[model samples]
Target: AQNPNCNIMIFHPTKEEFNDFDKYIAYMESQGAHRAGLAKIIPPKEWKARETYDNISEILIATPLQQVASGRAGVFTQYHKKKKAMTVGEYRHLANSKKYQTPPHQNFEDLERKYWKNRIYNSPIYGADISGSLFDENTKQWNLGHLGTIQDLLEKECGVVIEGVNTPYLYFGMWKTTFAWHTEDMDLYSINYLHLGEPKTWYVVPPEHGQRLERLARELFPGSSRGCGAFLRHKVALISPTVLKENGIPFNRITQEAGEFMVTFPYGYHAGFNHGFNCAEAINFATPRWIDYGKMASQCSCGEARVTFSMDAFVRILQPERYDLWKRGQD
Candidate 1:
């Protein structure tokens, strides 16, 4: 049995108020003021190359655990990506072509079955306008375009900023559901927001417990083997708009109007479940910076290093193209 009390953290207003980039620097000082909660949120101000070493020290001091947190932003917009449209007759003609054949192991129906079981599958709807890729050859990095506009607003309104030089920022098209579970990578902080659909139930647990649960899930759900250890472990917290109680834990209901929340956990385990049948659209950005592990040992504090190289290797498969670009830029 887990202690429900362990899962609760009093909402820190000072930290909550600094949800944008402008206020992020000052927030580092506030974090230094409270050395205990430092691991809870990773400040974006740490990303700027010109930031003072003192400020970086303050961030490390505040977050003694060197925990990495994720930040996310979301919004509803009238504009969206658009693809070429075809008539019903055109679709039927294409389907009847000799080129279309049922594979030995699959047919249209089988594909549909697999998709439905993977409830989080995303498909482009008819007449929906979609945006083109935001990669620029000159910059050799990805851009968020209008989504960047929204991030600016979030920085102005929320006042939280991630810190690091040449930080990676990428945008994903509308996704119906998140197939991955609660997992963490490197020293980076990821931010995600749902721009469409109703809020969902988010599940979270510590890393150790997540491992145990994943093993059990694999044994239970044969077709759905916990692909990677990048998902939830034990019961920690939940996010949604409507307050609901589960396993004696009360989840913070996050709404579209509230913008997005910043998650800070060095190897924290968490995941979310959609609350309704409608697809959920969200955007996520991550700042790749980790706490200075050497500093922690120099402080003479009893600390143990948690090795998770395998988890990082697995997540690499999901973003080979983008990773290649970033790696090339670094070289």
Candidate 2:
């Protein structure tokens, strides 16, 4: 059902629908799966288990806090040039402090600074690389490295663990906290699982409209994009769905609840907000099809574009085996 009204496709995979990762995803791709830039997967209920987050509770790390701001477009990168370390319980209190306040003015600064004495507000933690942490090791479902039928094809071949790409990044979000519109680094596919908590709203521009989205972002944030065409990689710009629609950029909106997975396609531009306090884990993985895009992404870069791993080296390492397989096919 390809609806033009921007409703993203949802998949409830049966054994047949997801028996083999490549085959399943290939079939979906052929059926216009790329039209929405992402799809929502609600895995079967049997994929659950009771596990301990004892490791997570004791962990301490400093994360850059983002300040919530006004406008329909929401928050931008408000990094205060410093980091703060707090327990998860402390963060939970800070996140819920502004809960009942007015939407436009309910900001973290109001409540947090009373005790903390900082001028800036603490938004949710994005890209928290707790890769080897508790949930990453215990959660078997949507484990990015071995997701369903789609194992990390890159790692299966290369055997190199590329930090946040092959491993995982844990995200903690609160109401009104935003993730800016950006494509995954190196144009790789990314899958995010809402481990628990509130729904996250995602706005994804289809791959066909990715260039248009980039143009809009460039026009909106010329200061950031000047000389560096990959300004989106900075993850500081926030353009609202209204702004995108006004500018003729087609996009889809999807609300991802707990127990659901959101898979972002290669080069698909996406931005979103958290409804309330939530924890999620995400990682980037590559399929055979992503090889060309990964190479293209590396080639079309400025100094600002972050490269997690070398595409050239990856291609070099796997090309010989692929060529040999091709030669065998000729016989």
Candidate 3:
């Protein structure tokens, strides 16, 4: 929030919360769970934070797709799909370099270089601390991150390997680089931790108003959507709390600082802008509760998602796991 008087609740996870990380995890998934708000886990150690990615020039995280020249040209989800043209490599290079010819600018020659604000959505970052469990330099496996890595255990027990949607997507943000209201891939849960630099502000639609907001967004502005979930991925619209109050759709705002974790639940419409130059890592993961959502999301159009997971295959593998047992008992 640009709020001078910000009063949003910021929660911190306690050691006790991890007693049954699974229980805590499920509670995280509920609310039909959208806009989980800010949860302060311990910060990334100083070495991993201030030192690791301090230099924007080198690679930050590794995924097979991120290394290849062809991979560098990943999808550009900015609103101007036609006019919004730039690859991950070009954008990243632009971000990391300082060469310039200017009337008064140092990094960019022309002030019209405004389009650079269109975020390089999901540019893969590689590093020891930020890498999580999703990728490996040699293995290049998706079995990374806590929820995403849960796949590895399944592979061992179920004897079939399946790709997971959980991958760390780097956010190379400047002034206008933004994410419109949306949710995680496959409607899964997501956690975004700002590593360094200024804070990012968030606007969220609560669980009770989730579907209604997405539906209304569709009704008002129809287009090729961007950033996972409801709301078209065009320019980040300023759907401020005042507008939200007018529409009777519950909304919230938060300013997420560096080292804090910002979580988004299943289909909670969230969108915001990076306050300034910053580095952040985000991933989508699955919990036992994510089982139903995985199946449901798989059935919807994948056009807007950044990445998606296969629930049918996952369900088949973990046939009688706790989630399935719950489903079995209920159905």
Candidate 4:
């Protein structure tokens, strides 16, 4: 979970004679999450990051994530490449299970593992926009606490109410593992939290700079983004932040350390690589503000739809759900 103090702006004036803490608690309540933009909340200042997240974790092999009293153990694969996909249960377990034990060879010489980089699947159960959970309260899993997430809101409340992109997922990654540069599904918001292991390197262009970066990408590396499907993984070249800065295209970065979270607002273009073996959780969400953005992504994607979100139907039902919530809040 992000820290309590990060939410201070809405807090009552401590210097005032009468502090209305209710006003502050409300800030903490709908809790009103992030600004819905591109930002990296990194080390030493996760303090500021905490105010936005309801909750948020680490490990190195031989291990730390498993050390916790609350732990889930899932076996994931190192896919040979992206879109050559599989969910755990979807596999034919009887057929040789995908194997990855560091070969009978060397250890980190330059602190690099020779393990082949491949896509890993992590499926996370999602819930509604409401406070409750689909996971039984008694289920032995990580605590949601006040961290009932936006994923929770979309999951439990309404996104799932339609078929639009609302599913949250988990992932386990290894060296050179990458997520290609592209805006998130339906141009909704996304958050990636690294619970354990090494950092992930992220390259981001603010939503406005998205097309600018795309044109820049083409000018520098002509054929790169041309062949791949739009949401495909890692087609964008790994252009350094310095390079973008020199080129006059502004960007933000975090070689995202374990125990940190990366927030990307709708239409922000981001691409990244894993520095080493790691585990991460990511989820996409839709707030009422997301309606128009979802439409734009739909058009650009040529109507490529993700099972998680179905725009046409979801938009009609979304406004009133949120409006009623806001109206009820003042009462």
- Separately for all candidates shown, the number of backbone clashes (residues 3 or more apart, or on different chains) is 36, 1, 11, 24
Model 1 lDDT per residue over 1-331, tens place: 3222224232333434443532442344343311211122222332211222222111111111111112211101011234345432342233234433212335433433332343322222221112222223332111222223323332344464422222222212111222224344442333333322333334444432444444544443333233322212212112221211222322221222112233433334444433222221222333212232111111101111122233222223334344443243323
Ranking by lDDT: 2, 3, 4, 1
Over the stretch 1-331, how does candidate 2's per-residue lDDT look in tens digits?
A: 5545435788887745544656656666666675678988887665642264444544454663654433332223433233577666666556667641224424433322231221124444432545543344564544555652223466565475432234666776666566778888667788888877767888898876788888877787767778566778767677765566678888877789887888888888898777667778787767778766665652224444434444434433445434343233323
Q: Which pairs of residues clash in candidate 2, taking residues 3 or more apart in a chain or in different chains?
A: 21-149
Give the per-residue lDDT of model 3 (tens digit) for 1-331: 2222222334444545534544655554342233332333443232123334534544433321221111111122333221233443444554444421112334321222322322342232212123432223432111124343546535654466877544566665544445656655445667776766655677776544567666666544444333334334322333434445667766666677776767666655577655445667777665655555655542222333222234445544444343443334224
Model 2 stretches astray by more than 4 angstroms: 1-7, 15-19, 49-55, 68-81, 99-127, 133-141, 145-165, 298-302, 305-331
lDDT of each: 0.28, 0.62, 0.46, 0.42
The per-residue C-alpha lDDT of model 4 at residue 283 equals 64
Error of 4 at 162 (Å): 2.6
Task: Please give the range of 10 consecutive residues that has the lowest summed lDDT in model 1.
Answer: 57-66
Q: Name the candidate that leads on lDDT.
A: 2
Candidate 1, superposed: residue stretches over 4 Å from native: 1-4, 8-176, 194-197, 221-258, 274-331
Judged by lDDT relative to the true structure, which candidate is superior, 1 or 3?
3
Model 3 TM-score, all chains together: 0.57
CA shift at 104, candidate 3, in angstroms? 18
**How many backbone overlaps does candidate 2 show?**
1
Q: By TM-score, rank the candidates, best first.
A: 2, 3, 4, 1
